[PDB]
Amino acid sequence: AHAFWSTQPVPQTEDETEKIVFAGPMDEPKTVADIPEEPYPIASTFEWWTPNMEAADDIHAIYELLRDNYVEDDDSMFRFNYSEEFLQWALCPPNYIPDWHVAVRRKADKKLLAFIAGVPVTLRMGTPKYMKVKAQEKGEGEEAAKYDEPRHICEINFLCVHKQLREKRLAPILIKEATRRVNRTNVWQAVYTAGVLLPTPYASGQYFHRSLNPEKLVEIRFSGIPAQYQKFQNPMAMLKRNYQLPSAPKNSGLREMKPSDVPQVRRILMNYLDSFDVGPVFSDAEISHYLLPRDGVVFTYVVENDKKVTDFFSFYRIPSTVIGNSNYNLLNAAYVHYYAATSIPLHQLILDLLIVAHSRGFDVCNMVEILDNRSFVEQLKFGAGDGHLRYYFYNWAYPKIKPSQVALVML
Numbered sequence: 001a002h003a004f005w006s007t008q009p010v011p012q013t014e015d016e017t018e019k020i021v022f023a024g025p026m027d028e029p030k031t032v033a034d035i036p037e038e039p040y041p042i043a044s045t046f047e048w049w050t051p052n053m054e055a056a057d058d059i060h061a062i063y064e065l066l067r068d069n070y071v072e073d074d075d076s077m078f079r080f081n082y083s084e085e086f087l088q089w090a091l092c093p094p095n096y097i098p099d100w101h102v103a104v105r106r107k108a109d110k111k112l113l114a115f116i117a118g119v120p121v122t123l124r125m126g127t128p129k130y131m132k133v134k135a136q137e138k139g140e141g142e143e144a145a146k147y148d149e150p151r152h153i154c155e156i157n158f159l160c161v162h163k164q165l166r167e168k169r170l171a172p173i174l175i176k177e178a179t180r181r182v183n184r185t186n187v188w189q190a191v192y193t194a195g196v197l198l199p200t201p202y203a204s205g206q207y208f209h210r211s212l213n214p215e216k217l218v219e220i221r222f223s224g225i226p227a228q229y230q231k232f233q234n235p236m237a238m239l240k241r242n243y244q245l246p247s248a249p250k251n252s253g254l255r256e257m258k259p260s261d262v263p264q265v266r267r268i269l270m271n272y273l274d275s276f277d278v279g280p281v282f283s284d285a286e287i288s289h290y291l292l293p294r295d296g297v298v299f300t301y302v303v304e305n306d307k308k309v310t311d312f313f314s315f316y317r318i319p320s321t322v323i324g325n326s327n328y329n330l331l332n333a334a335y336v337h338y339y340a341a342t343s344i345p346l347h348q349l350i351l352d353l354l355i356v357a358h359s360r361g362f363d364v365c366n367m368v369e370i371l372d373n374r375s376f377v378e379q380l381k382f383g384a385g386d387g388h389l390r391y392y393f394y395n396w397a398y399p400k401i402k403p404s405q406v407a408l409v410m411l
């Protein structure tokens, strides 16, 4: 039983999803005027709050809530510690809607107790290529293609209820109130990811990580150990030797991205992302926002040959609190973001990402097996983690697809 999810416009079982052939809406069509004007009722001790993401103190409140109460892994070894600067970046992209950031505070003392964030995204989410094929053989092309145009929808992230308030059914109210504010803007679909299984993903992929600072990494789980390394003499030396990387990028032509690279980066990224079934469409302002280097937050490099950008990669920083281990309390992780390769194999481009991250002091590089991320796992010594990222739509029927048909990176 899902007392909440059974009431929502999502496919209810894997079986139902396995039946889906064309992209399209689940719900009755509705209009903005059908949607309540007033926020969803909540207990009189609580209030709704729309944080001002331009206010340092509002970003700090969100930061603290997530630092202490956001996502942990299954064994509670790590909890994400998104930084304030990271939050301001992720929550405030071009044309963001301040009303879509939704918080619940205790009225008496203004303690933040819960948060959910929506940002706008323009997403391709029409019927996948493999079904557009079944549709032709069968004579139904126009129907299969009806929703091919990129849609301006909502991307949901940072859902978080304070640990003191867990299992009190607060998450459904947050989700209902966000849905109301997005629908009041004449938006009827959302996309979201989670590490938990809910009804019902259209895709799921494993996490993969690449050790950059193995001495620290093995210590968090906790020398001896790894099992396979004990079996010889200088095991720490063998671990360091296995994961060592060059001090400097190998690709001549590599350099940090600059504002004048925006058009070229936009073009080579959009030609690449277009090949996938689900993927975002970015304007120049969105490329500038999500890809231009920002200290501590997002790191982007291009390969430039004869003043032409031919390849690029990006990664962003999310440190995690290390939970029990006393010595090291933060793990500095670099996450593979968007990239495009036209002049060199993908593994050669991403080796430079690992070199740069390592040189900048990151301990590990992490990613999900979306995009073409599988194509460099073995050669660059990534290993599968224990997590799986599931992709979801709200109010959108969508066939099941492989994660290598997904091009949307969620922060």
Ligand SMILES: CCCCCCCCCCCCCC(=O)SCCNC(=O)CCNC(=O)[C@H](O)C(C)(C)COP(=O)(O)OP(=O)(O)OC[C@H]1O[C@@H](n2cnc3c(N)ncnc32)[C@H](O)[C@@H]1OP(=O)(O)O
Residues within 6 Å of the ligand: 001, 002, 003, 004, 005, 006, 069, 070, 071, 072, 154, 156, 157, 158, 159, 160, 161, 162, 165, 166, 167, 168, 169, 170, 171, 172, 175, 178, 179, 182, 183, 187, 188, 189, 190, 192, 193, 194, 195, 196, 198, 394, 395
């Ligand atoms: C058109 C616009 C639409 C916009 C909205 C689109 C939908 C957006 C949907 C949100 C996408 C978020 C994307 C991310 O940010 S995924 C990251 C989510 N955050 C965390 O994991 C942080 C740590 N955990 C918590 O803060 C809480 O445990 C949360 C908040 C997750 C649950 O709070 P709590 O543990 O106190 O439980 P409750 O008693 O209040 O509520 C229980 C109900 O909640 C359902 N539940 C549990 N986990 C999730 C989850 N990750 N997504 C959606 N639903 C979830 C659960 O199945 C149950 O429903 P049902 O089984 O009874 O039916």
Ligand SMILES: CN1CCC(CCCCc2ccc(S(=O)(=O)Nc3c(N4CCCC4)ccc4ncccc34)cc2)CC1
Residues within 6 Å of the ligand: 071, 072, 073, 074, 078, 079, 080, 157, 158, 193, 194, 195, 207, 208, 209, 320, 331, 333, 364, 366, 384, 385, 386, 387, 388, 389, 410, 411
């Ligand atoms: C948009 N948005 C929504 C929330 C979604 C939930 C997170 C998915 C769960 C989820 C994410 C990732 C993993 S993991 O297998 O990579 N383990 C973790 C690692 N590594 C493990 C060993 C090397 C470093 C390092 C740091 C971590 N920090 C926190 C949690 C796990 C972490 C395991 C589980 C993530 C993305």
